[PDB]
Amino acid sequence: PIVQNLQGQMVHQAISPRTLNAWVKVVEEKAFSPEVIPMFSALSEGATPQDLNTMLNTVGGHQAAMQMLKETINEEAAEWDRLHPVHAGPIAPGQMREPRGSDIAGTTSTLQEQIGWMTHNPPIPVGEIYKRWIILGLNKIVRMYSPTSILDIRQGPKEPFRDYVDRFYKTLRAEQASQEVKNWMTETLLVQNANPDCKTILKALGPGATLEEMMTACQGVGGPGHKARVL
Amino acid sequence: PIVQNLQGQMVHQAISPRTLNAWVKVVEEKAFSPEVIPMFSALSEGATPQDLNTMLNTVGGHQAAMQMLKETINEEAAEWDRLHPVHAGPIAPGQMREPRGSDIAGTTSTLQEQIGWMTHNPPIPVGEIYKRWIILGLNKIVRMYSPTSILDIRQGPKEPFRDYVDRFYKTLRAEQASQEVKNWMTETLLVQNANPDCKTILKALGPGATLEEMMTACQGVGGPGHKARVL
Amino acid sequence: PIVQNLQGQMVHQAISPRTLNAWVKVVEEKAFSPEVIPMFSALSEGATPQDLNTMLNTVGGHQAAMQMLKETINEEAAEWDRLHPVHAGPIAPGQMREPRGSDIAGTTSTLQEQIGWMTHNPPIPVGEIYKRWIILGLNKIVRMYSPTSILDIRQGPKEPFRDYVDRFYKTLRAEQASQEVKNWMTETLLVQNANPDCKTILKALGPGATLEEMMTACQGVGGPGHKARVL
Amino acid sequence: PIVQNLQGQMVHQAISPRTLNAWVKVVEEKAFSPEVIPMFSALSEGATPQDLNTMLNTVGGHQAAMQMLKETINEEAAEWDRLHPVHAGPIAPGQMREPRGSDIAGTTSTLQEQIGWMTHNPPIPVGEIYKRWIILGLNKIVRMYSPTSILDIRQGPKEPFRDYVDRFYKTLRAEQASQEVKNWMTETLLVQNANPDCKTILKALGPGATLEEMMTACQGVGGPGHKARVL
Amino acid sequence: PIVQNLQGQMVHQAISPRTLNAWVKVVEEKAFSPEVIPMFSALSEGATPQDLNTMLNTVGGHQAAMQMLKETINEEAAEWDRLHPVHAGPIAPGQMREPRGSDIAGTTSTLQEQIGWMTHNPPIPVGEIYKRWIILGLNKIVRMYSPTSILDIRQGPKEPFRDYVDRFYKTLRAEQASQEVKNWMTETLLVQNANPDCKTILKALGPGATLEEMMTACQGVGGPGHKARVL
Amino acid sequence: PIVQNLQGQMVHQAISPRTLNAWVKVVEEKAFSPEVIPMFSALSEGATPQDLNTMLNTVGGHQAAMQMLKETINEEAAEWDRLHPVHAGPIAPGQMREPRGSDIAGTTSTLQEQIGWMTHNPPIPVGEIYKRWIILGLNKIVRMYSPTSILDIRQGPKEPFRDYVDRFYKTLRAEQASQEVKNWMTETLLVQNANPDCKTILKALGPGATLEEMMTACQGVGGPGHKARVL
């Protein structure tokens, strides 16, 4: 991708072999996890569509997910092109006739063509646009991996608090829906998806407070609660 | 590879030792996989034929595939020599020589002259055509590797949807077919080779469905397709 | 991150992939160990909010632990809005407008604007205050140590003195108590939970002796307070 | 070795420890293998004689092979100082002294003087000459490697076609003979060493059929072959 | 740590992650080895107190030894405040403010003043003395660690000279006492704790032998089954 | 050590910590191997005495041998102080004072003064001399290690030529003598130390023809003994 700023005009150099092997190893290890989504954003330095396309094409065993990602990139590009078409038709010389929705994608554009519009005129955010579509596609494809929905969490009699809290927050990481609505729901959910003993501990603590105080109380007990009568 | 722009005129630099170690290791771990074909394109940076030639020479286990690759390069070089512009016998003074089919290869050319025809007069696509000829050879190698075929992927009685479509996508890489063909065959084949239970779910959805719509529906249905007409 | 000043005005460099890979591997093997708290402080180079948040966002299974830390940051941001200077809405011309509690976090602040107020006019310590709140969140991570209490330690009869010293130091990493209390407690508690066989030596050495003097004497007693062979 | 053109006049650079350890590992794991011959030329960032002499001296176990190679270099040096343009003793003061055959090597030449004949006046290609002599010694070493004969690569009754091909390519890289002669022999060898059932399909395809054509026929038949024809 | 002079006046750079990961690895591999002490001196380049404290604070297993080292830093700082470069009453403003024993420490010095007095005024060895105090603490740790102390090392009935001398030099690395006494005891101790079979050979060489002379003489004795040949 | 050329005049940097760790790991995995001796020259990125001395000081393993090497250097420095240019003692004001024989070594030398005599006027070759002395000491360590000398090793009765020749060449590396003596000896040695089985083919080869001719003939023999060959 296009790198460096300090020594003058930015230079195009491919991603490091260590970085490429690290990317391949990360998806070999963590394949469908949503924890890989910010990792992809971290390696998107210089955001260059052809290099990003090449990074996308160099994936290992879980390649079916990347074929699904291609459908989203095509759909999103078509949406963007139809949303913005005002510049279409005749435009004066000295300009490079500006990228269309399909020109954003490295698969349908040439390398010299891409670099020019990111630095010879007021920079087009093509890498940023392509990156958000890929991040959006990554958010969409992790839905297929999902083994449990928010109200599908069922807790047995001998399950420990540590497993219950970890299961819920991992399940909640695949939501994407409104944060305010999620907090509001979460407060009711913890008591409802609990087992009798855990439910007794949550009921004992009563309404109010924050996660830290509830965690501090749960920490004092640990494991699968206590067994003696509450009335 | 020949590289440098910002600092001034390009210079032929040495190949990274990490890149050669990575190429040899990638061959040791996964040589026959179609995921390695984009990796070769990615690491073909600065395209010097002599440097590119080292990759074919350094290959271990799959030497027979590399031998076919050398034969393929000669046949494409023969097409370049005889069907593409042959060019005149007389050569003007000062000219850097427009390469013949034998001049492309590092074993029948010398490095300073090889650099010369890519850097003195306007660019000649010697690196790009050599990359393409190697890629054409790589595209044929997966045909000879394939242990199964696209219509030999049949969903068994209790086989889940993800494994079945993973198998279909993995063997699809081996056919080397056009985007038009992939687009028009994908719609019918998944339903056709499906088991009765899975086919019943897919059949119900019918005409007018996109791949994402079908995949989204499959996530809600789950497993090998749940049995018909008993609910 | 933000680097350079004397050798050229500051460049907005991204976090190293090598440090992210180390962070991913350290959390995987060392979990919530006290040793990672100075490592995180060191790795938070330049402390830019959006960039620093990427380390928190790239955490795997431990999403619930991250949620408590994220809640602590929101709690501290709310504390800043309420108990630290309010800041008037009307601001003089040619200003960038000083951060409110929400502005300090990368969620609602714009990266370009955030960089602008951090250094283009006399430095606002936004990264340093944000980093201190994250360290405060890491000071609450010690409450995830199941049944760990220094008052609950007991040295068994066949347990070596070195193992007991190691246990005492390991649980002493979870302190969260004032130095005066620690100084008083250490003298009496260490003798109290020590095994009788080596407790006799601690009693023999008696008051006044320092940690160095106790350790020097305790190397010579061997195993649980007496054992055969020195080789 | 000596490198640098764009930023001035060549400066001496020390060999990389990562590369040196990689050379040691390749020497340990691929010790006498024919695939090391392109690697040595590929990973040598300028064939400076003294630096190349260090590479020969850093061998572990198979010192005997390196001493045979060193003697081969001494023979080549002597032929160069006899059969090639020999430099006569009388000279007019002001030359940097045209090297003698043994001076091509780092053992009778001083490093400052050696770099001097590579930079002071028109360069003498001493590094390339030394590298070619090393390649001649490596050609001797691959004949010492050989623990079988191309005529002794017989495919057994239960041995697969790919194992026969694997063994055949392993011994082929050590065969050192003219390609035109080898290609005529290759037709004979194919039916000479193939097992009855495999030999049956090879005979059916017949001469004038490329390696790809034979692979296509053999791939369909599969394994060590089977009775009659595989349908 | 601090670096740079020719390109511009000193800049305080971040600690290397390779150094920190290496420090964790070395501690895991060989926590108490006396080869760690010069390695720590090599890794401590630039000698910045906060960066030096980062190494102390990241130790896992033998953190108890590091806590004794923390006491040692305070103990030497107390001596330094008392007897070395003492500061009296309030001094005239516009100065570094004549460092006290506490000021040397990372916990009592801010980044601005610690690097400030080093880059504005002529360089002061505050980092160098802090490093020397840490080394003094490391020297205490090896002295405490010692399993066998000086006279303990001896040669058994069947023990080779090779193992006996190896144990003596291992013991001498953790010795931490006067060099003059060490030079003197080296002359007699080796003979005294030797087995009669080897002891007579050592005495037969005559008083006054060097380590080289003793090693050369011991080559004739060597390994297992050392039957004397002195007459 | 002092390094840097293109970015301006020499700067005193430090050896990379990955390389310093690798040096320790080489000592751990290859304690007495002769391969290490040229590696020291290769890794020497600036020959500054203190940095080189630090590498010697980071040795754990074979410390008894290392102390003999260090004392050898100290004694060779003393030899320089009497046989080589000792100098009168006095020196002119406004000069870098010129190093005395002992002070070539790190023990009585300080870094600013040491750098000054390698900067101000044509460098005093203290690094080359110190490096040369270390190589002289390294040669002693392999010589001290030696299990058997050249005339103490013969080919065993069931031993093959390859194993004996490997033992001979490996052994010869540490037997410290002139190149001519080794050459002159080698011609006689093979004939006299051959076993009864292998002597038959070696005597058949006879005088005139060199080792390459003998080794080429012996490749086809079949290992040890002369069993009646089948295939």
From Swiss-Prot, chains A, B, C, D, E, F:
Residues 145-231 are annotated as: Dimerization/Multimerization of capsid protein p24. The modification Phosphoserine is found at S16. Residues 85-93 are annotated as: PPIA/CYPA-binding loop. Changing P38A: Retains infectivity. Changing N74A: Loss of binding to NUP153 and CPSF6. Phosphorylated possibly by host MAPK1; this phosphorylation is necessary for Pin1-mediated virion uncoating. It is found in: Virion. Residues 57-95 are annotated as: Interaction with human PPIA/CYPA and NUP153. Changing V59A: Loss of infectivity. Changing N57A: Reduces binding to human NUP153 and CPSF6. Reduces infectivity to non-dividing cells. Retains infectivity to dividing cells. Forms the conical core that encapsulates the genomic RNA-nucleocapsid complex in the virion. Most core are conical, with only 7% tubular. The core is constituted by capsid protein hexamer subunits. The core is disassembled soon after virion entry. The capsid promotes immune invasion by cloaking viral DNA from CGAS detection. Host restriction factors such as TRIM5-alpha or TRIMCyp bind retroviral capsids and cause premature capsid disassembly, leading to blocks in reverse transcription. Capsid restriction by TRIM5 is one of the factors which restricts HIV-1 to the human species. This is Capsid protein p24. The gene is gag.
